[PDB]
Design a protein around this ligand. Structure first.
Ligand code: KXP
Ligand code: NAG
Ligand code: NAG
Ligand code: NAG
Ligand code: NAG
Ligand code: NAG
Ligand code: NAG
Lengths: 942, 214
């Protein structure tokens, strides 16, 4: 509609445009068929109708690929094409049975392609599910039917009245009606980082994609979806994988060399025996049989190549993530960028924020200094002085914000709800605990009496109000952090309910008696003062520094937030796991250290620095006024607690730590900042956590991982998963390598001693499938155990294959090779089942090779279990049942193996076996586990 | 009675020289209709012509061509005159079972199909102590069937102490003789029990090690 051109005000043009079109904002509001600020009908048919025709959904499809293109891409492998053309040549050349081999090869190739395509499709579906949930998580507050409610961002439709608070992210283009101090940065669209102040009279335009900085208010959405000025730009528009792919290409080269050697050896042996030893000329009558022998040798070589080269190894890690992320959300770790899933595993330092993480963010009062009497416990109103409760309750009710109301508990026998400012809610809760109610006073106390209200600002560090109710006088009530207002107050009201003499002489005694014990106990101090201004002809209230002097302190209240019961154990575990945790906060140093000593960050009897922001900045800028890395290199290693720190100080600390060369191992840090100015600091770090319950959308937008419960322990959970991924890949690799060794050997020397390999094309394709795809789905998706936090973080230059894995691979390969060779050369005697050795062309399948194939597959199946442990744990069956996928895959493979050996003889080059032969094959399979238990006793260090 | 003069009998050796069989209708007062060759009573293909004298040319003599050839003479109003030329060579065994695996208590059979002429006489023997000994009917479980080209030996109610071994068929005739062998093995009934006990022992030792480790 015309609304598309109604945007891009950029000044005072669109205001006159709306004046010309409809006059004012209320006029377009009524025309919009939308209820004004009071509410909205919210009926489903009307909202859905205005969503279809009058609006646009926020549903970019991105068009994920389908199964057909996936299988088409999977079919594009070169080795499979070579196998296909070789099979076609062998099939056609049979007539110049034999077609069985070609048909079997074609069918097996098609089946392998289909299985790979299905696996890729399932993994992509898992990722899409995670993305759907991450989209669902978003929510914005609006008002409908006079009720403030939070709805998914995808649901907002033109006409909704949205409520804007500081730190929010605007989802749609709208119009400003009412609010206070609405200052927003629009640098994402205009490129200028200056806070534009919106007003009804000068700029009522609010644009999606911009970050609200200060103020609050309401807006009416006009443009949504692709019609917005931020969607036009869209419309007109790791460490482990490198090592994995390097190893893959090395193994591929080795396999190619081995295949070429085998083929040339077979060809040379055949031609020398046929023509040189036996005196036969180059007859043209027996050319087809010679070329058929050549094609058989080539097929053996191609199968050796197709098993030797590992395909999809660098894709292993992704698979693990696809089956881990959906479970990580159960630990309240909602991850946005997958690259940080494993990087957090290597993390060595964690920088934490006091409020929200370590505290419960609830205000509880324990001790108070009133009537010149200290009270370690809450005192009853009986023991109190004269007029102090009435005046104190009146001052608390008047001075505090009226909009913030403590809701009734209604929590089914739990703690009452807290709404508004935390400290203010704590004072109101204390007042209610003293058997006084501020509602009767506030109801009878109109806003006109408060002519002057100084809201808490960073510069003033106090919040106060003035009322002109007394005759020829005024009464002002102030609240401060007990340090700013302590200088202002010059009389003591706690003597007998009357003012006394307050001087700098007893200032020392009072501050020693009051501030020090609360600070040691970990309590921030709030002081309330009042004074009676005389009715001067014109008091100068603008200069609050001087006029707001000579106060009388009613009392002093110590307020604090309990530390969660889980943070001590989590911090101890993190310190055990080689990760050091530092604390950065804006509160004063005394309470910061008091909290840190309880949280276990800093030991009591140790020399850990606890310098504040001022000394930090001074030390790093002892030069002409710049920050150097060298000075930070002597401060960061032993810096634990930082106090009175601006966010830029946190950014400087993170930058100094992350790129330091002072230590031999590069540092990777995790910062959990949350705020409107915490953008660069959070972004600079490797992985940046954000808060979920109470967090600004700007902080969430630039964070890799969010915590849906704000608890510090959740961070620990991340570390666990960040390690588990790596371990998972490790173990999978182990298993595959073992197979890849034995197969190659069993086809090289088999083609050297005799003229054939014990395993044919279809059998070896099935072995490839079980060794790669089912192995990846079974071993690479395992649940983590809490023992993963008992080892130091891994370095960057760590070899991918550890010593224990190499020991396991070599030992199991040796056992398998010796047993298979014994069965191949001597197994005719043991079973009395004749010999399939030196079989002529198109020979019927013989039991002697079926036993070899079956025992090879059985050894692989029973060694897959033995490969679940990397660190030499003897209890191979520990925690096997926690992963149903592994058990399902192993049992399904075993059943399919039984079916393949018993039935489908000729196409698979197998022959039916009796119970005796199967029993010996399973006996060998279990002997594999016995040898795997035996090998663990070898010391790898020696 | 028509008079037919036939070529002399031929013995097929390994020599590569092709053989010609001749027959001439020297005396016949009947209007001839046709003439044609037979081997073992079977019509040879592409052999019907006027052919008052007929020549049959075999380019590649082998034992599988030796047979009782006739050149039959069919007249308009006279009985056919057949005559006979015999071609003989040493017998050649063409097919046999290389092994016979049967569980005790079942039936076993072994055959030695051959080609040649005269139809050889078959003798079965057992390889005992490195020599060949003639089989003994004894309990009567051995059924030996002989035919013009096919022979078979069948055993009922297989035991475990005499039946396993090696049996040879010897196939002798006037020109030569030819013999081949077959191996007979009988499986025990309680064979599967031993590997099951092995699996049980491995499970026992594995569980003992695991529980000791804890
Ligand atoms: C065994 O015991 O498993 C074998 C796998 O068997 C087959 O897969 C072979 C397939 C058939 C071949 C035949 C027989 C190990 O595989 P690998 O030896 O080929 O891989 C190494 C290893 O990963 C090192 O860690 C890397 O680095 P570094 O040596 O320094 O430590 C080194 O790279 P590089 O030396 O060039 O720098 C890699 O090549
Ligand atoms: C062959 O032809 C001759 C001459 O006509 C005739 O006497 C003789 O019977 C024929 N033999 C056949 C048709 O078999
Ligand atoms: C046999 O018949 C052939 C073919 O006609 C002839 O050449 C040959 O002389 C005949 N032999 C006798 C003995 O009649
Ligand atoms: C020809 O007839 C004689 C009559 O004694 C018979 O023995 C011979 O088998 C017959 N030939 C054929 C090929 O049937
Ligand atoms: C062996 O004796 C039995 C007795 O019934 C008989 O059936 C069988 O034919 C005999 N012959 C041979 C050659 O073993
Ligand atoms: C044995 O002779 C018969 C005659 O009817 C024949 O059917 C069968 O094929 C022959 N078997 C051979 C030659 O192996
Ligand atoms: C067959 O048996 C006869 C009589 O014992 C013997 O002379 C001959 O060598 C045997 N050999 C073959 C190969 O048939």
């Amino acid at each position: 509609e015309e609304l598309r051109s109604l945007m891009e005000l950029r000044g005072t043009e669109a205001v006159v445009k709306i004046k010309e079109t409809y006059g004012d904002t209320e006029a377009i509001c009524r025309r919009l068929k939308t209820s004004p600020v009071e509410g909205l009908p919210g009926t489903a048919p009307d909202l859905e109708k205005r969503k279809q025709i009058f609006g646009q959904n926020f549903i970019p499809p991105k068009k994920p690929k389908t199964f057909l293109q996936l299988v088409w891409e999977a079919l594009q492998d070169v080795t499979l094409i070579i196998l296909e053309i070789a099979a076609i040549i062998s099939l056609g050349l049979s007539f110049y049975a034999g077609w069985i081999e070609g048909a079997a090869i074609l069918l097996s190739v098609i089946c392998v392609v289909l299985v790979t395509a299905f696996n890729d499709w399932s993994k992509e579906k898992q990722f899409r599910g995670l993305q759907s949930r991450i989209e669902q998580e978003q929510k914005f507050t609006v008002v409908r039917a006079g009720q403030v409610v939070q709805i998914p961002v995808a649901e907002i439709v033109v006409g909704d009245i949205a409520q804007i608070k500081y730190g929010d992210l605007l989802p749609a283009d709208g119009l400003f009606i009412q609010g206070n101090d609405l200052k927003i940065d629009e640098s994402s669209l205009t490129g200028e980082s200056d806070q534009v102040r919106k007003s009804v009279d000068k700029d009522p335009m609010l644009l999606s994609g911009t970050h609200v900085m200060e103020g609050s208010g309401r807006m009416v959405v006009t443009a949504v979806g692709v019609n917005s000025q931020t969607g036009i730009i869209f419309t007109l528009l790791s460490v482990l994988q490198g090592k994995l792919t390097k190893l893959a290409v090395q193994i591929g080269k080795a396999g190619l060399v081995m295949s070429a050697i085998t083929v040339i050896i077979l060809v040379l042996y055949f031609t020398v025996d046929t023509f040189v030893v036996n005196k036969k000329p180059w007859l043209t009558e027996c050319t087809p049989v010679y070329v058929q022998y050549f094609v058989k040798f080539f097929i053996i070589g191609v199968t050796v190549l197709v098993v030797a080269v590992p395909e999809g190894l660098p894709l292993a890690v992704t698979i693990s993530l696809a089956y881990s992320v959906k479970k990580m959300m159960k630990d309240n770790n909602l991850v946005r960028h997958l690259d940080a899933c494993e990087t957090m595993g290597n993390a060595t330092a964690i920088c934490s924020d006091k409020t929200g993480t370590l505290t419960t963010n609830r205000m509880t009062v324990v001790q108070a200094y009133v009537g010149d009497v200290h009270y370690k416990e809450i005192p009853d109103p009986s023991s109190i002085n004269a007029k102090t409760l009435e005046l104190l309750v009146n001052a608390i009710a008047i001075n505090s914000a009226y909009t913030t109301k403590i809701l009734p508990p209604e929590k089914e026998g739990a703690l009452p709800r807290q709404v508004g400012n935390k400290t203010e809610c704590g004072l109101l809760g204390f007042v209610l605990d003293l058997r006084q109610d501020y509602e009767p006073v506030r109801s009878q106390m109109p806003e006109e009496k408060l002519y002057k209200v100084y809201t808490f600002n960073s510069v003033r560090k106090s919040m106060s109000t003035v009322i002109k109710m007394p005759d020829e006088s005024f009464r002002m009530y102030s609240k401060g952090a007990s340090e700013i207002v302590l200088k202002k107050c010059c009389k003591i009201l706690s003597g007998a309910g009357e003012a006394r003499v307050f001087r700098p002489r007893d200032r020392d005694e009072m501050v020693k008696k009051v501030i020090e014990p609360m600070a040691c106990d970990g309590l921030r101090t709030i002081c309330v003062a009042y004074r009676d201004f005389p009715s001067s002809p014109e008091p100068d209230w603008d200069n609050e520094n001087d006029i707001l002097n000579e106060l009388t302190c009613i009392c002093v209240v110590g307020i604090e937030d309990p530390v969660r019961p889980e943070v001590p154990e989590a911090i101890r575990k993190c310190q055990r796991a080689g990760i050091t945790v530092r604390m950065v906060t804006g509160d004063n140093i005394n309470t910061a250290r008091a909290i840190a000593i309880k949280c276990g960050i800093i030991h009591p009897g140790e020399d850990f620095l606890c310098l504040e922001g001022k000394e930090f900045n001074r030390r790093i800028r002892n030069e002409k006024g710049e920050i150097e890395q060298e000075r930070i290199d002597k401060i960061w290693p032993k810096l634990r607690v930082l106090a009175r720190s601006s966010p830029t100080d946190k950014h400087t600390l993170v930058k100094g730590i992350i790129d330091s060369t002072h230590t031999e191992q590069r540092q990777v840090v995790a910062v959990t900042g949350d705020g409107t100015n915490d953008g660069p600091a959070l972004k600079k770090a490797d992985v940046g956590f954000a808060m979920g319950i109470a967090g600004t959308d700007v902080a969430k937008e630039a964070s890799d991982i969010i915590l849906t419960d704000d608890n510090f322990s959740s961070i620990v959970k991340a570390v666990m998963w960040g390690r588990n991924v790596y371990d998972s890949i490790s173990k999978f690799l182990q298993f595959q390598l073992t197979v890849n060794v034995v197969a190659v050997i069993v086809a090289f020397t088999g083609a050297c001693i005799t003229q054939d390999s014990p395993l044919k094309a279809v059998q070896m394709l099935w072995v490839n499938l079980i060794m790669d795809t089912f192995a990846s789905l079974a071993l690479a998706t395992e649940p983590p155990t809490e023992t993963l936090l008992l080892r130091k973080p891994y370095g960057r230059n760590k070899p991918l294959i550890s010593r224990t894995m190499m020991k396991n691979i070599l030992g199991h390969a040796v056992y398998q090779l010796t047993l298979i060779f014994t069965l191949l050369f001597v197994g005719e005697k043991m079973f009395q089942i004749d010999s399939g050795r030196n079989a002529p062309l198109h020979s019927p399948p013989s039991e002697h090779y079926t036993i070899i194939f079956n025992t090879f597959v059985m050894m692989q199946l029973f060694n897959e279990i033995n490969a679940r442990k990397i660190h030499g744990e003897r209890n191979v069956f520990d925690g096997i049942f926690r992963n149903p996928i592994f058990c399902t895959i192993v049992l399904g493979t075993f059943a399919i193996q039984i079916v393949i050996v018993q039935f489908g003889g000729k196409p698979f080059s197998c022959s039916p076996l009796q119970l005796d032969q199967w029993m010996w094959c399973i006996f060998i399979g279990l002997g594999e586990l016995v040898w795997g238990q035996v090998i663990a006793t070898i010391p790898t260090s020696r | 009675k028509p008079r037919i003069v036939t070529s002399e009998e031929v013995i097929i050796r390994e020599s590569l020289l092709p053989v010609t069989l001749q027959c001439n209708l020297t005396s016949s007062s009947h209007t001839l209709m046709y003439s044609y060759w037979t081997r073992n009573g079977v019509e040879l293909t592409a052999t019907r012509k006027n052919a008052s004298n007929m020549e049959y040319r075999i380019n590649k003599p082998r034992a599988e061509d030796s047979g009782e050839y006739h050149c039959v003479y069919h007249f308009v109003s006279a009985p056919k005159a057949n005559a006979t030329i015999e071609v003989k060579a040493a017998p050649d065994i063409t097919g046999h079972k290389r092994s016979e695996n049967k569980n005790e208590g079942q039936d076993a059979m072994m055959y030695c199909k051959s080609v040649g002429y005269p139809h050889p006489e078959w003798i079965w023997r057992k390889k005992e102590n490195g020599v060949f000994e003639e089989i003994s009917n004894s309990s009567g479980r051995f059924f030996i069937t002989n035919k013009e080209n096919y022979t078979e030996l069948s055993i009922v109610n297989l035991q475990i102490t005499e039946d396993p071994g090696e049996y040879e068929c010897n196939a002798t005739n006037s020109i030569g003789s030819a013999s081949v062998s077959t191996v007979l093995r009988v499986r025990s009934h309680l064979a599967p029990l031993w590997p099951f006990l092995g699996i049980l022992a491995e499970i026992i030792i594995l569980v003992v090690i695991i529980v000791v480790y804890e």
